């Protein structure tokens, strides 16, 4: 069957269309800019990309431009995301291409389940942090206006992107799926520098600005991640929201597993504001599970496949 895969030229998306070649799909993979060969030579060289991949020129920006791409899809999977005035160039295009996608899978007649990629950032962005995160939780739209922390417009755009997407397809029977996966994590097949492993390796890299995301920390093997894209995309049984995260811990914890595996860097031992009883946030996968799905990777799996891909391709010093 044929499939649609937005934001094929990232580090999910390619991911993904490589699964989803693998597993024997037809793949419609769009891209802004095909011309850009950075991008598109990874995905032509997946495995079946010749004879089972096409590829499609599209933007969010642009309304309708995901309607031929669609067209003929019994399956799209939206995980392409907009990356001076946030809530115009950030904010507006996100709920607007969500609901874009759907208009595009209305139109196409043919879609029998879009499944969306969300963001953790939907779930637990409030002041104070419950112990553990489940599917009814949303972010606090309120606190990321008035305290503006990094990525703030990302939460905002995701959450009301997810929830105005939630409106539409209860009114227009649109079965729809959606996926919360927390820090991904692992190697890749792009050439530029996966923006989530800028934040995973922070504490080799000394990228302060990115602590905050793993002083509580969750993390999704990107190979998991993507399984578990497919596989609700096929068990007709899924319904809601599903979590997809496999281990939660402190940045204390993170970067004593990394001390031990990679002493060549320079991975220090204590972090600001930050005590060893400070509790870990778990995101509950277990939603995800007793439908029958199950995690294959572990945190040292994740870094491991990152660090070792990120020195093949020289985003990271080999040691410091
Ligand atoms: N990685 C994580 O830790 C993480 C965690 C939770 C959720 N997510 C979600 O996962 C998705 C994938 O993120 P990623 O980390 O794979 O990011 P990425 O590698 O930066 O990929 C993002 C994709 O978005 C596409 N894109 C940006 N602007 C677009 C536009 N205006 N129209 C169409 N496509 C556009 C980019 O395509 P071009 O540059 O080719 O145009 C790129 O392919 C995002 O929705 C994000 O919110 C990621
Ligand atoms: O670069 C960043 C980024 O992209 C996102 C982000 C968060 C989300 O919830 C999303 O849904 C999303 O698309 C992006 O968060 C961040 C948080 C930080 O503390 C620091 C960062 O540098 C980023
Ligand atoms: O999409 C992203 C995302 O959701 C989160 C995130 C992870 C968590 O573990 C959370 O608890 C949380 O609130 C947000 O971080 C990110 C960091 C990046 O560099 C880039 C991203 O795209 C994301």
Known sequence: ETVCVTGASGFIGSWLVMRLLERGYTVRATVRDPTNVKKVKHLLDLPKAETHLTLWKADLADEGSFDEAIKGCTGVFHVATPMKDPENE????????????????????????????????????????????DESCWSDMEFCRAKKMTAWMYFVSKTLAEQAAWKYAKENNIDFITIIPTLVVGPFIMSSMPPSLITALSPIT???????????????????????????????????????????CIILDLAKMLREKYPEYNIPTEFKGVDENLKSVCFSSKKLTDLGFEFKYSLEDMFTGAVDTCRAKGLLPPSH
């Open 90 to 133: 950030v904010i507006k295009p996100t709920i607007e291409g969500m609901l874009g996608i759907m208009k595009s899978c209305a139109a196409a007649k043919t879609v029998r389940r879009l499944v969306f990629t969300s963001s953790a950032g939907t779930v637990n962005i409030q002041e104070h942090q419950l112990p553990v995160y």
């Open 206 to 248: 000394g990228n302060e600005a990115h602590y905050s995301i793993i002083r509580q920390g969750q993390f999704v093997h990107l190979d998991d991640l993507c399984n578990a894209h497919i596989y609700l995309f096929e068990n007709p049984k899924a319904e809601g929201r599903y979590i997809c995260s496999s281990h939660d």
